[PDB]
């Protein structure tokens, strides 16, 4: 064989170009920097009203409004300062696994097992919430709707491919293929020109939303990657597996920066977020809890413990003023 | 309180939204959500005919004051088992495996590994699993081909119909690691009339009344 030999030596000697220029681990440099202690965060607001498991949640762009999508076919937009429900949207299919908020507060996209990413319009002239556009064209279940503008949305799916749509016409504009299993998550970059996606084949990959380019791949886990987010400056990102490992990869250094596991942990990570300074890597877990890892020393600097079921969604605001968590016991709790 | 003239109306809107949410959660809790599963080429366009009549495929029928929604397996393709955690809180898992499963050609290792998988999954090991062995048109005409040494080394004796059916039942209970929570409801019938709906009406009202007992804390 010839191309197999060339691809084998390509992967091994590009990994050798990574290893020979690999200087040191992150903790080797940041070891002398002092810790942050115990971040005892308290439940300020408890948002009740859902009557089933809560699967995903997205903050508003003004750090005050929330969407939460539940299993009983309800999408609720919360005013998170007075714990008031701004909107309640009855979905068509109650098998909703993800939801998103527009960065202008106008639209809201939500989807799931019926392979259709619905996009709803809140700021109407009639005072209800009508379905603006149902993006159909996926052949399996949907995850991580993520709004770019009011006319442009990325959606991951179980079709081993993600898709950049176009809400005006309604057709799948760009198609990102390259995974070998269900793609469970994606997270938009803060400059809204890149994204990363993690899939069930124990891998993530960094894609460009402009060219449809498979720019980078990222391995290191043993199991599926369940959720994903970016470091808030858009140069690193942390994934969470069912390996009970959160991992921080750098987009430029092409390997994992550092691992965020503890030996006492039994079960795997369901959600991952970040604080606004990029210091508190939060992580919701499958037992009951959330853990607030100090993102430079990998020490659990606090445990958010309410949540009589498994935590399913995390979100930190644009200013960093709160952490909303949501779990299968139908309660979002806000932690400050 | 210290609310303005518009915050009181925002609070009134939020309370009305709460009212609508729980008055439809009443109906969303008083409806029978049945997951539906089966093996490869088992026959499913003959029991969905029997009831009172892409992504997930949902089938409605209202039978004897009970609104049955049935969510089928014939919509999804990904067997990574990532769609199973959405299906907790279902009333029953209507499983359909027939006796002609070894026609399309080993069923033993894959079937018992799937059942050890759902007895490994924490979600399906506490939910009731209704079983159907429905027809009597070909269940007797293919047992008498030969002894069952070709794919099934668990048994090496004489193979009649109903004694081997009881043997399949007894090895099906051998698949269960813990019968302390889940409860199997097997059915050996003639799929001729609405006898097939009276083992998903009775075998699900038993689960309804068991959940009502253990939500009273009574038994």
């Amino acid at each position: 064989d010839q191309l197999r030999q060339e691809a084998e030596q390509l992967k091994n000697q590009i990994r050798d170009a990574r290893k020979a220029c690999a200087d040191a681990t992150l903790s080797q440099i940041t070891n002398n920097i002092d810790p942050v202690g115990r971040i005892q965060m308290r439940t300020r607001r408890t948002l009740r009203g859902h009557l089933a498991k809560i699967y995903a949640m997205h903050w508003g762009t003004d750090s005050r409004l929330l969407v939460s999508a539940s299993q009983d076919g309800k999408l609720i937009i919360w005013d998170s300062y007075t714990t008031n429900k701004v909107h309640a949207i009855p979905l068509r299919s109650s098998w909703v696994m993800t939801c998103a908020y527009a960065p202008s507060g106008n639209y809201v996209a939500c989807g799931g097992l019926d392979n259709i990413c619905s996009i709803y319009n809140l700021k109407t002239r009639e005072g209800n919430v009508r379905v603006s556009r149902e993006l159909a064209g996926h052949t399996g279940y949907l995850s991580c709707c993520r709004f770019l503008d009011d006319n442009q949305i990325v959606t991951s799916s179980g079709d081993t491919t993600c898709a950049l749509w176009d809400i005006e016409t309604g057709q799948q504009t760009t198609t990102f293929t390259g995974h070998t299993g269900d793609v469970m998550s994606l997270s938009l970059a803060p400059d809204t020109r890149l994204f990363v996606s993690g899939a069930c084949d124990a891998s993530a990959k960094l894609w460009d939303v402009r060219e449809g380019m498979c720019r980078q791949t990222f391995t290191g886990h043993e199991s599926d990657i369940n959720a994903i987010c970016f470091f808030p400056n858009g140069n690193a990102f942390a994934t969470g597996s069912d390996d009970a490992t959160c991992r921080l990869f750098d987009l430029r250094a092409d390997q994992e920066l550092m691992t965020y596991s503890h030996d006492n942990i039994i079960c795997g990570i369901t959600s991952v977020s970040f604080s606004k300074s990029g210091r508190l890597l939060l992580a919701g877990y499958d037992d009951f809890n959330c853990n607030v890892w100090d993102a430079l020393k990998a020490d659990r600097a606090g445990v958010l413990a309410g949540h009589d079921n498994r935590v399913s969604c995390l979100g930190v605001t644009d200013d960093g003023m709160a952490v909303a968590t949501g779990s299968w016991d139908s309660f979002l709790k806000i932690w400050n | 309180c210290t609310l303005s003239a518009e915050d009181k109306a925002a609070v009134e809107r939020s309370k009305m939204i709460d009212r609508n949410l729980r008055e439809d959660g009443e109906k969303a809790a008083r409806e029978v959500k049945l997951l539906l599963l089966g093996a490869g080429e088992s026959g499913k366009s003959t029991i969905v005919k029997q009831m009172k009549i892409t992504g997930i495929v949902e089938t409605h029928f209202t039978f004897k004051d009970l609104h049955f929604k049935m969510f089928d397996v014939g919509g999804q393709r990904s067997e990574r088992k990532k769609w199973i955690h959405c299906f907790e809180g279902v009333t029953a898992i209507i499983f359909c495996v027939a006796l002609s499963d070894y026609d399309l050609v080993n069923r033993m290792h894959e079937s018992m590994k799937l059942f050890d998988s759902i007895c490994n999954n924490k979600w399906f090991t506490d939910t009731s699993i209704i079983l159907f062995l429905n027809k009597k048109d070909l269940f007797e005409e293919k047992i008498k081909k030969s002894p069952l040494t070709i794919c099934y080394p668990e048994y090496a004796g004489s193979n009649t119909y109903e004694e081997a059916a009881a043997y399949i039942q007894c090895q099906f209970e051998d698949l269960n690691k813990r019968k302390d929570t889940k409860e199997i409801y097997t059915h050996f019938t003639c799929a001729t009339d609405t006898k097939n709906v009276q083992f998903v009406f009775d075998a699900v009202t038993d689960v309804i009344i068991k959940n009502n007992l253990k939500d009273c804390g009574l038994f």
Partner: single-chain antibody, 232 residues
Framework: VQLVESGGGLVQPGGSRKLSCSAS????????MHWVRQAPEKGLEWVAY????????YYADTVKGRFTISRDDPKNTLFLQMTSLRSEDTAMYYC??????????????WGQGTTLTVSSSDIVMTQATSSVPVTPGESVSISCRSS???????????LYWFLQRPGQSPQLLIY???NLASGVPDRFSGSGSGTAFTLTISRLEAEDVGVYYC?????????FGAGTKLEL
């Protein structure tokens, strides 16, 4: 969206009348409804309010207990039943929708109004003039003053700038201080603090003339300004 009222006409004193506000084009069961009135060549005056689901009902203290408010939600018809009518109840009555959540524009669409003619503590808001002459192309500033500080502890300053072109119904321009309404031209702007509130109109076109108004929410009853009329 089309709010349209019916029930106007001439009545003698001592009688009792009823107005209907038929809505066509929106979700009437999700909107609170104000009744506003306007005396001939004097100015606006708020009358009554009913929230969504008929729970909260407020009136103005002039006719509190003398009017009543009715509502039909699966028929979209809003009623005001007036019990006794003096020579001050004669007005053009408007039927205004209002939705209250975080970020709404709660005096957005005004109905067409209906004429009713009868034969023969509270916050005071003061507007400075009654006629200002100007030509197009000239940026104009209007101002009005309030009794209390309208700046609540939330941060919201519950002041509303409306415009009534001659022969028309009013139209929301500014709903708290610096928030433009739904699809008004973006040459308008509002500013001020606490008690002094100014509306600046740059690049003034021809159809921007008409009687301007400033209103406070903050507390019931709602009180309108006197009404500055831009002249050309």
């Amino acid at each position: 969206v089309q709010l349209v009222e019916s029930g106007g006409g001439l009545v003698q004193p001592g009688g009792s009348r009823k107005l209907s506000c038929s809505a066509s084009g929106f979700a009437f069961s999700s909107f609170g409804m104000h009744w506003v009135r306007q005396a001939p060549e004097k100015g606006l005056e708020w009358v009554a309010y009913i929230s969504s689901g008929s729970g909260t009902i407020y009136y103005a203290d002039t006719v509190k207990g003398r009017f009543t408010i009715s509502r039909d939600d699966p028929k979209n018809t809003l009623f005001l039943q007036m019990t006794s009518l003096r020579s001050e109840d004669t007005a053009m009555y408007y039927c205004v929708r209002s939705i209250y959540y975080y970020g709404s524009s709660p005096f957005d669409f005004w109905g067409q109004g209906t004429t009713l003619t009868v034969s023969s503590s509270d916050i005071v808001m003061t507007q400075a003039t009654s006629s200002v002459p100007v030509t197009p192309g000239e940026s104009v500033s209007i101002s009005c003053r309030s009794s209390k500080s309208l700046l609540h502890s939330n941060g919201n300053t519950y002041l509303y700038w409306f415009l009534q072109r001659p022969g028309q119904s009013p139209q929301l321009l500014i709903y708290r201080m610096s928030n433009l309404a739904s699809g008004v031209p973006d040459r308008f702007s509002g500013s001020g603090s606490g008690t002094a509130f100014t509306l600046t109109i740059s690049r003034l076109e021809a159809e921007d003339v008409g009687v301007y108004y400033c209103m406070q929410h903050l507390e019931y009853p709602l009180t309108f300004g006197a009404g500055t009329k831009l002249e050309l």
